[PDB]
Amino acid sequence: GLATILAISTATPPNCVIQADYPDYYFKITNSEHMTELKEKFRRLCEKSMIRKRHMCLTEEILKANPNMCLHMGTSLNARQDISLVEVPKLGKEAATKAIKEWGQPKSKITHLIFCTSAGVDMPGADYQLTRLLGLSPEVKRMMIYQQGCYAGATVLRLAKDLTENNKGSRVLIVCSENTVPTFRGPSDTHIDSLVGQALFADGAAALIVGADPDASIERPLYHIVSASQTLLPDSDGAIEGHIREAGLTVHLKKDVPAFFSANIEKSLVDAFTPIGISDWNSIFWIAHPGGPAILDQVEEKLGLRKDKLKASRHVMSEFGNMSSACVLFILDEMRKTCLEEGKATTGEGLDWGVLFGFGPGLTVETVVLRSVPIE
Amino acid sequence: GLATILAISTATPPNCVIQADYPDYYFKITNSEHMTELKEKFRRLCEKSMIRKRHMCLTEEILKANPNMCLHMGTSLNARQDISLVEVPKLGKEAATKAIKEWGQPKSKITHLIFCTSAGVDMPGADYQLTRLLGLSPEVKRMMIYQQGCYAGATVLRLAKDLTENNKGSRVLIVCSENTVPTFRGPSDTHIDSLVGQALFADGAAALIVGADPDASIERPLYHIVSASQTLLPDSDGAIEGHIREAGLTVHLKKDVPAFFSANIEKSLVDAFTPIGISDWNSIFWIAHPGGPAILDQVEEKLGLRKDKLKASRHVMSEFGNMSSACVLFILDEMRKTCLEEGKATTGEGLDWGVLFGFGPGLTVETVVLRSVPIE
């Protein structure tokens, strides 16, 4: 009885920004059009991002009401909190409602809730807000995963596996909800790494139902969570940092983040798949947190992946940008929907075994081994 | 094979404040001595707190260097973060080293780390900092429980139970580390509830080793974690709130918080103990988060507990104050040490079954059922 994903749904705020137009908009809304060379640098970041569009509850109108958010380091945490702390459970509820509808069982059967966001902290947390918004049972067992950044979409699966497998009959609702409200800020020609965030980060929420021992008469498995690991990369201290400050969430990068991930990723593959007898990385299906396009390019190069292995991952990046923890969950939804639509033999692009990677601060790699489910 | 507590240790910062002297010190350091009636109110809060002393890394010297922290609502989150983000894993390391020493096994056998704090958020988190400070394996499986307030000492036991029981051979290190750096602030005669926090909150860290299937030749069980539940109290929305703002962590209370907990606590007892055939609440040993003295008084009254049932809980409150998540772990250490010293028959004051309560925002009650271990 492995933890099994039984439903997936997603949600995004209606407001959408076209990446091709973002450099003009961003340098206008931040009053930085005189920064002609930095605008060109940002234009190249956006072109290289391989993102077509991003959803953002931050509208021009809200930014106009919050000018300190358009500065690079304007005092603005309170304004960011006021917006984000409402948005996070609101967007998460939209995804959760759809996931519960697909699942088809009463919400009273939800025994556990995992909520995950890096978009703003509060007491009680977004898990409490979502519980009240959805009308979950007051006895729902909640785990609130705050501020773990971009690997946390795999973290919640690692958590959900132990929760559901140790508690017979349990059904876990997972909700990840992320947005750019804490990180949006104006440009600085001494903080280029902050510009990278302005080119990549986006809003989105994903919700899943997870449970061991599915009842085949009422539930439909999509993926089985076989194993889940976490590791810190050698000599990587300080590569990615995010600080929660009076100016909001500031982001700090070293140059060769992609090099660390690509140089170390095969060790996670070896540890996870050699015990199963698997060594051909093109023979498994892939879900890779795509928030750094260079990371996927370099992993693909390093391992010699066929250019289609990362297609669903890069697809979600193109249509949605870096939604932090939400991305890998969006990608799972994309994969199982595409495989059903195309008559593939399994929810894992016709393959039996799969890998799901989360990447983020540490540097941390989360490695989840999945089994697909046959499609008949 | 139940999750079993195998070692407990604690740590506090050296700087200690005597409660009898705190009202004079507090109104002097905050330049509020003209607030004679509010000082009398605060003096009564401190006298009624039943706290003798509290440990605090916040010294007079640090406060003198950070005058905005002595205002009621001075911009000061950055200053608070700069202090707290270093202190939290530092104090947690002191407790973890001692717990690992008591446990007696190599740190390479630690497979999971749970870190818990409400004293400040950062990316990577305090779990990462502690892992590097202690030299844990880079593959240690980490869970970072941020900002869950005062019930989170039971939350980490609920988490640790599922982690260790679902992973054969696993050994979990739990560290809770809390301090007053985010919440210390000057008085306001329109924010009386903030004064309550100034009378109660304290610094402390606790660390445990938890594992299922102890090896009796090298390990010594103290408590078994039988069950763990969480529930939200009816009609309690908004009773306790904490907001992370430009002025730090602000705390907001309604009047009858103790009434909600005492009125609802027996339902948690019934749900947890009736299935085991237990109904006499004086026949189990008690660990109760003591951070609200009125809560313990009213629970004792409501249930008719003999006046000694809460002795270890009130003892930790007297000697250490409200250390948030750390308290219930300090209390477990106190109980097992006292029972060994006094020749009691079990680590649970001679009784076989016990209850551990966490109380906090929601309103949330965490209910952990424990079994004691015989003492021979």
Question: How does this model look, in words?
Answer:
The structure is a homodimer of 376-residue chains. Chain A has 376 residues and is α+β, with helices and mostly antiparallel strands. Chain A has two domains: 1-221, no CATH class; 222-375, no CATH class. Helices cover 38% and strands 23% of the residues of chain A. In chain A, strand 13 and strand 14 (364-372) form a beta hairpin. In chain A, helix 1 crosses helix 2, helix 4 packs across helix 5 and helix 10 packs across helix 11. At the A-B interface, helix 4, strand 5, helix 5, strand 6 and helix 6 of A face helix 4, strand 5, helix 5, strand 6 and helix 6 of B. Strand 10 of chain A pairs antiparallel with strand 5 of chain B.
SSE blueprint and pairings:
The structure is a homodimer of 376-residue chains.
Chain A: E1 4-11, E2 16-18, H1 22-29, H2 36-48, E3 53-55, H3 60-65, H4 77-103, E4 112-117, E5 122-123, H5 126-134, E6 141-146, H6 152-166, E7 172-178, H7 192-200, E8 204-211, E9 223-232, E10 240-245, E11 248-253, H8 257-273, E12 285-288, H9 293-303, H10 311-320, H11 326-341, E13 353-360, E14 364-372
Parallel strand pairs in A: 4-6, 4-7, 12-13
Antiparallel strand pairs in A: 1-8, 1-9, 2-3, 7-8, 9-14, 10-11, 13-14
Instruction: Give, in order, the helices and strands of chain A.
Output: EEHHEHHEEHEHEHEEEEHEHHHEE
Number of strands of chain A: 14
**How many structural domains does the protein architecture of chain A include?**
2
Largest sheet of chain A: 9 strands, mixed
The assembly state of the depicted protein chains is homodimer
